[PDB]
Each structure stands twice: as C-alpha cells, then as structure tokens.
C-alpha cells in the first residue's frame, strides 16, 4: 500500500489500478490520484478529476508523469469506455501538467489558462493546445471553453501561483480548488515559492464565492473536504499579509 507523506491515505472504496488510485465521488465523477517519490521525504499524492458527460469523458489535471497519465486513460477505457473529449489543467506545475504528452499522443484536446501555456516552457512543461481567458470577475470567457459541458472554469486571482484556475462540476455538489485550497486540518499553505502572498486570501475567498453551493471541495494534495477547507485556507493566508 502507498502511504503518502503528503496527501490522503488509501480508504475503502478506492480502486488501485497500476500505481494509481481511483475513487468515485458521484455517479459521474471520479478522483484520480498519482504519486511522486521525493527523496528523504516519501510519496506525494496529487489528485485530479474524471467526469462522465453523456457519451464522453472530461479530465481535470494530468498525473505527475506521462506514464501515469497513460494509465488514467487506460482506467477510463476499462471502467467507463467512452472517448475522452478534452482535458483542462489547472496550473503549470508538474503535478497538474507533467503528463501532457500522454494526452497529446492520444489525440485529446487540452486546455489551460493562457498564462499557464505562456509559462509552461519555463516550468519544464508541455503547453496545452488551447488557451482559456477570463473576465475581470474571474469567470472563463465562454468562447475559450468550447464544449466544456459541466466544467465551469473560474480564475480566482493569484494565490498558489499567478496562473492557478479552479473548476466547478455543474449538476453536482463538487468544486475543485486544485493546489490553491488546502484541507481544514492543514498546518500551512505548503511551499510558497511561486505564491502571491498578498492576494492569496482574497483568491481563496473568491473561489468560495464563485461556487457558493458546492459542499464537496476536491483539492490536489488532500482528500475531499467540506467548505471549511476554503475558509481555513483563507484565514491561514490572512496571516501572510
Ligand atoms: C516539482 C514537484 O513539486 C510540485 O510539482 C508541487 C506542485 S503544487 N510543489 C509542491 C511543493 O513543493 O510544496 C508539492 C505539494 C510537493 S506538489
Ligand atoms: Zn502547484
Ligand atoms: Zn500541487
């Protein structure tokens, strides 16, 4: 069993598939979890989402590597058996974009914040094929999110990184905060090296206000939590200013 140093442990209802873990959150929504070993530190988990929308599947975030991301696609083939229409990635760090080549090799259309695509080369990432842009209130410009179906993309402002984006799943109680939101038991906001400490708290609060009725908050490095994760994150970030 994989017992990560960062991220949730394995729980009943989880399915191991290769070195990845999959957990159903709702009839048409699953969380994907992949792991990276950090020397002297142990395993670090990263979570993303898989959404069944009619006759197609939509993915939020890659795994850490191409090989792990290919296994996401294999799991989808086995357990859902519908084509993957698109993937959205939520910022230009390895846990979210490290597997872009596996998606492109498979012919899957990929989307990221334009700024994420602009930063990807510097971050050692392969840029997505398409760029999302955002209104002043943070909501995606819909022409840049073609056929996103239930994925409702929101840019909350700079926080974890300047490019971080978030995704609500329409028709469910689920919203995905990515690496911006930490669970309510977190002791810190983690590594702040790329973070905007001035704007982080407001960005976290903006995420909460954008998806006011989501009751299950999914995040990159913790198990799903209640809305308290948002407020606790924002109050930790208040201390950075
Ligand atoms: C290059 C590996 O690092 C990463 O890709 C992340 C991106 S969020 N960095 C975080 C950090 O260093 O705190 C993390 C929680 C370990 S995962
Ligand atoms: Zn990150
Ligand atoms: Zn992360």
- Ligand 1 atom 12: residue of nearest CA: 191
Give the Å distance between the CA of 43 and the centre of ligand 1.
Answer: 11
Method: X-ray
Residues near 152 by Cβ (< 8 Å), separated by ≥ 6?
140, 167, 168, 169, 170, 211
Where are the alpha helices (H) located in the chain, listed in sequence order? 66-79, 94-97, 100-105, 114-119, 200-210, 228-238
Residues with a beta carbon under 5 angstroms from ion ligand 3? 95, 179, 220
The CA distance from 171 to 153, in Å, is 14
For CA atoms 120, 125, 128, 134, the dihedral sign is: negative
Q: Which of 140, 171, 143, 136 is nearest to 153 (CA)?
A: 140
Instruction: Please give the sequence-ordered ranges of beta strands (E in DSSP) within the chain, or none if there are none.
Output: 14-17, 20-26, 29-38, 42-53, 56-60, 84-89, 109-113, 130-132, 151-154, 166-169, 174-178, 216-219
Tell me the domains of the chain and their CATH numbers. 14-239 (3.60.15.10)
The CA distance from 216 to 175, in Å, is 6
Would you give the distance in Å from CA 225 to the centre of its chain? 14
- Expressed in Å, this structure's resolution amounts to 1.4
Q: Which residues does a 6 A CB cutoff place in the pocket of ligand 1?
A: 6, 44, 93-95, 179, 190-191, 221
The CA distance from 209 to 151, in Å, is 17
Q: What is each CA distance from 128 to 48, 167, 176, 226, in whole angstroms?
A: 16, 17, 19, 31
């Amino acid at each position: 069993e994989i017992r990560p140093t960062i991220g949730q442990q394995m729980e009943t209802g989880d399915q191991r598939f290769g070195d990845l873990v999959f957990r159903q959150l709702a009839p048409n929504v699953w969380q994907h979890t992949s792991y990276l070993d950090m020397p002297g530190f142990g395993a670090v988990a990263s979570n993303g989402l898989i959404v069944r929308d009619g006759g197609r599947v939509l993915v939020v975030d890659t795994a850490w590597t191409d090989d792990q991301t290919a296994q996401i696609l294999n799991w989808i083939k086995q357990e859902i058996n519908l084509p993957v229409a698109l993937a959205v990635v939520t910022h230009a760090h390895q846990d979210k974009m490290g597997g872009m080549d596996a998606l492109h090799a498979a012919g899957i259309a990929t989307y990221a914040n334009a700024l994420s695509n602009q930063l990807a080369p510097q971050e050692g990432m392969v840029a997505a094929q398409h760029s999302l842009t955002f209104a002043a209130n943070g909501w995606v410009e819909p022409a840049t999110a073609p056929n996103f179906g239930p994925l409702k993309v929101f840019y909350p402002g700079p926080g974890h990184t300047s490019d971080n984006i978030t995704v609500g799943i329409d028709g469910t109680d689920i919203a995905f905060g990515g690496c911006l939101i930490k669970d309510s038991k977190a002791k810190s906001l983690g590594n702040l090296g790329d973070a905007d400490t001035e704007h982080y708290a407001a960005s976290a609060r903006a995420f909460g206000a954008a998806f006011p009725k989501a009751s299950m908050i999914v995040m990159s490095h913790s198990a799903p939590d209640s809305r308290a994760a948002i407020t606790h994150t924002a109050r930790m970030a208040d201390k950075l200013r």
